[PDB]
């Protein structure tokens, strides 16, 4: 019984590969060759957020593009006024082994998780005037890798137990479980419409899941090693992945395959974080080589470099208005680039 | 700056001061990482908050020294995914069941259990993150090993072992075998103790080793060691 089903799976995978190859008409290099290059991008540091005492593991911009939250291994969640450099909130964590943090797209809640296998939701707008823990989502077997608010009451998490989970925060129960990944899920990215989301895991594959139907819509397999970072194109029809094979990749949802590879001989280290520019023309990636690279997403040539982190660049994010970039690194500093 | 801008600046300054006092308070604790292969007796060491987290933290105090001990057994992923989080601990306490060198009780080449203990020790001691972190090595179950070495020899897992089957000789052979896995003997120390479960010398030994580690860290941070 097992032999027949293995053979059927082999035929199905072969037919998927054949359909993908038949769909591949022309690369995004020949039909983007007439595009003028962006040239040399020169972004300068405008702000330096000091105050974390251990390395920074995650940061997230608020939707107003002025407030941001960072998570550090000193057990602390700090909200920063990117404009004045003022720190608005300092939230102590019951577990200092934090790995992810999210900012609700209303400003009222923050989330954080890590090696405790629990996603803690903190209320930022309380009548008593201090940040208090709103809920603790428990049920993941492994550590929390990423979390993203769908809404004030819905949150999607990825964990090292090889599953993602959609949680209704009002009750503390996961409404949906997303299974199918073989390795630990490292990264998560929500579509701008929040109908779909994409996740990268240690099996070197990315999966697109329908949040409502709770099933895997598609699978993308081009990377040679673990996928640490994933990000949606602003259109919502493409996403970029960053792996530790020193390569970033671009995948189209409608074409169901990979479009472009962002790599260089001088680059040997793996990607920690990826993000797009407001129009999606530039792709920003942070590396273990202590800096970030700005790629022309259409032409796959390196447009610039954001060298400003004595340690590995662990997180990076672009504002909603596209004005500035934020990089958090293992040297305990946050830098804002214009 | 407006009045409200000034007040927000003052609030940010207050938060900064509180962060620095919290960092000073947190720097006072000696943080140790517990490690050991399957059924190595690290539970009986830690007995000498968490549901499935595998980040079990034990805080205690010995002779005015604050210890935070982190047990990471419940995490079922590869260590490469979370071991970098512990780059910066004062020491790694590695527990090895001395009396378990015949039974398999794990995936193994032909027949051993000390092989995976050696492999884990080699992977941990020789690691990018723990380049200078010291190891406190505990060799548990000395009496069961005594009777085992009386009934069975070390050869079935130590082919190069020579000398009469005695407790001290076999125990020192385990000493040497585990302590020679170090490849940077000029950078980090190994503190090895034969766990006397009938005495309180295990915690005293950890205290002495941690005191030595603290002194060495201070001295080599200023170029004196």
């Amino acid at each position: 019984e097992l032999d027949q089903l293995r053979q059927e799976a082999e035929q199905l995978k072969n037919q998927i590969r054949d359909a993908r190859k038949a769909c591949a008409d022309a690369t995004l290099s020949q039909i983007t060759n007439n595009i003028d290059p962006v040239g040399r991008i020169q972004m300068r540091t405008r702000r330096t957020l000091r105050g974390h005492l251990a390395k920074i593991y995650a940061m997230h911009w608020g939707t107003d593009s002025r407030l941001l939250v960072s998570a550090s291994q000193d057990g602390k969640l700090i909200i920063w006024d990117s404009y004045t450099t003022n720190k608005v909130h300092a939230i102590p964590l019951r577990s200092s082994w934090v790995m992810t943090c999210a900012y609700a797209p209303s400003g009222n809640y923050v989330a954080c998780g890590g090696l405790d296998n629990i996603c803690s939701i903190y209320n930022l707008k309380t009548r008593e005037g201090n940040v208090r823990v709103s809920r603790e989502l428990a049920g993941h077997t492994g550590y929390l890798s990423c979390c993203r608010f769908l809404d004030d009451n819905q949150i999607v998490t990825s964990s090292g137990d090889t599953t993602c989970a959609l949680w209704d925060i009002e009750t503390g129960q996961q409404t949906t479980t997303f299974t199918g990944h073989t390795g630990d899920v490292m990264s998560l990215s929500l579509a701008p419409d929040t109908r779909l989301f994409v996740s990268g895991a240690c099996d070197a594959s990315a999966k697109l899941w329908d949040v409502r139907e709770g099933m895997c819509r598609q699978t993308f397999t081009g990377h040679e090693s673990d996928i640490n970072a994933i990000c949606f194109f602003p259109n919502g029809n493409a996403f970029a992945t960053g792996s530790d094979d020193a390569t970033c990749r671009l995948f189209d949802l409608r074409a169901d395959q990979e479009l472009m590879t962002y790599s260089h001989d001088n680059i040997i280290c793996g990607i920690t974080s990826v993000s797009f520019s407001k129009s999606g023309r530039l792709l920003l990636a942070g590396y273990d080589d202590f800096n970030c690279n700005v790629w022309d997403a259409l032409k796959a040539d390196r447009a610039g470099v954001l060298a400003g982190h004595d340690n590995r660049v662990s997180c990076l994010g672009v504002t909603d208005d596209g004005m500035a970039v934020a990089t958090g690194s293992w040297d305990s500093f946050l830098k804002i680039w214009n | 700056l407006s009045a409200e801008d000034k007040a927000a600046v003052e609030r940010s300054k207050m938060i900064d001061r509180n962060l620095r006092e919290d960092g000073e308070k947190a720097a006072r604790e000696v943080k140790l990482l517990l490690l050991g292969a399957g059924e190595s007796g690290k539970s009986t060491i830690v007995k000498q908050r968490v549901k499935t987290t595998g980040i079990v933290e034990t805080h205690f105090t010995f002779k005015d020294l604050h210890f935070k001990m982190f047990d990471v057994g419940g995490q079922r992923s590869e260590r490469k995914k979370w071991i970098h989080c512990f780059e910066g601990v004062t020491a790694i306490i590695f527990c090895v069941a001395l009396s378990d060198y015949d039974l398999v009780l794990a995936e193994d080449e032909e027949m051993n259990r000390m092989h995976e203990s050696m492999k884990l020790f080699d992977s941990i001691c020789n690691n990018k993150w723990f380049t200078d972190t010291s190891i406190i090595l505990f060799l548990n179950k000395k009496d069961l090993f005594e009777e085992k070495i009386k009934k069975s020899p070390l050869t079935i897992c130590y082919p190069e072992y020579a000398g009469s089957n005695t407790y001290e000789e076999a125990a020192a052979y385990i000493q040497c075998q585990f302590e020679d896995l170090n490849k940077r003997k000029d950078t980090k120390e190994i503190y090895t103790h034969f766990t006397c479960a009938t005495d309180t010398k295990n915690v005293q030994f950890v205290f002495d080793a941690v005191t030595d580690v603290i002194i060495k860290n201070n001295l080599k941070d200023c170029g004196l060691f």
Epitope: - | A3, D5, A7, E10, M14
Partner: single-chain antibody
């Protein structure tokens, strides 16, 4: 959240008195505190401010040298020591909590007040009392001596409401933001030196005195007060 005042009464002129406020239900130490007096005949008047952490302290020009504001954080208490009290110091004294960070709402909660019996921005109310009926829309105007819009891009104008027999309650902060728990029928608008508060579909419980205050700089200045009655 509760702020309870105590220490009022009858004091002979030239004497001393101590007002104490007890705070409960909120993190007292992270809030700045204001003492605000209101005479039995006129409207509100800012008296003093102490910052969270006991840093800056501000006094009104008429109380400087005589009054002293302090706070005991472990006991969650706010103290006002007044000496050499004159006949002009008889008023109801309120304690206001006000927290300051990006996006906060200062002057959000007020105490019940205690009764004691013995350059600068000018805020002008165009009307002192207008007649209204339930179900209608009313507009209240306030004028500033100088522009309350700052270079940082926000206008430091606040609208408060005092219903008959209770302490003032925050309505609008920064000239445009609706306070928490306030019905979505009030709207603040305008520009520098000219502000309007509009109530659409008014009814009972809205009658009372509306005040406009500036927070551009110290001393904080209130308006004369516009009264809405049936």
């Amino acid at each position: 959240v509760q702020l309870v005042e105590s220490g009022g009464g009858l004091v002979q002129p030239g004497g001393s008195r101590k007002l104490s406020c007890s705070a409960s239900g909120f993190a007292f130490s992270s809030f700045g505190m204001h003492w605000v007096r209101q005479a039995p005949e006129k409207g509100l008047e800012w008296v003093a401010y102490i910052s969270s952490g006991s840093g800056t302290i501000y006094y009104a020009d008429t109380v400087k040298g005589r009054f002293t504001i302090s706070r005991d954080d472990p006991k969650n208490t706010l103290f006002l020591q007044m000496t050499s009290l004159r006949s002009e110091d008889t008023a109801m004294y309120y304690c206001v909590r006000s927290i300051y960070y990006y996006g906060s709402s200062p002057f959000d909660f007020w105490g019940q007040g205690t009764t004691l019996t013995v350059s600068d921005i000018v805020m002008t109310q165009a009307t002192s009392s207008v007649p209204v009926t339930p179900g209608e829309s009313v507009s209240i105007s306030c004028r500033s001596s100088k522009s309350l819009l700052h270079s940082n891009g926000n206008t430091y104008l606040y609208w408060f409401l005092q219903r008959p027999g209770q302490s003032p309650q925050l309505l609008i902060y920064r000239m445009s933001n609706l306070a928490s728990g306030v019905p979505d029928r009030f709207s603040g608008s305008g520009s520098g030196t000219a502000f309007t508060l509009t109530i659409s579909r008014l009814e009972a419980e809205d009658v009372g005195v509306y005040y406009c205050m500036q927070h551009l700089e110290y001393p904080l200045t209130f308006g004369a007060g516009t009264k809405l009655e049936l």
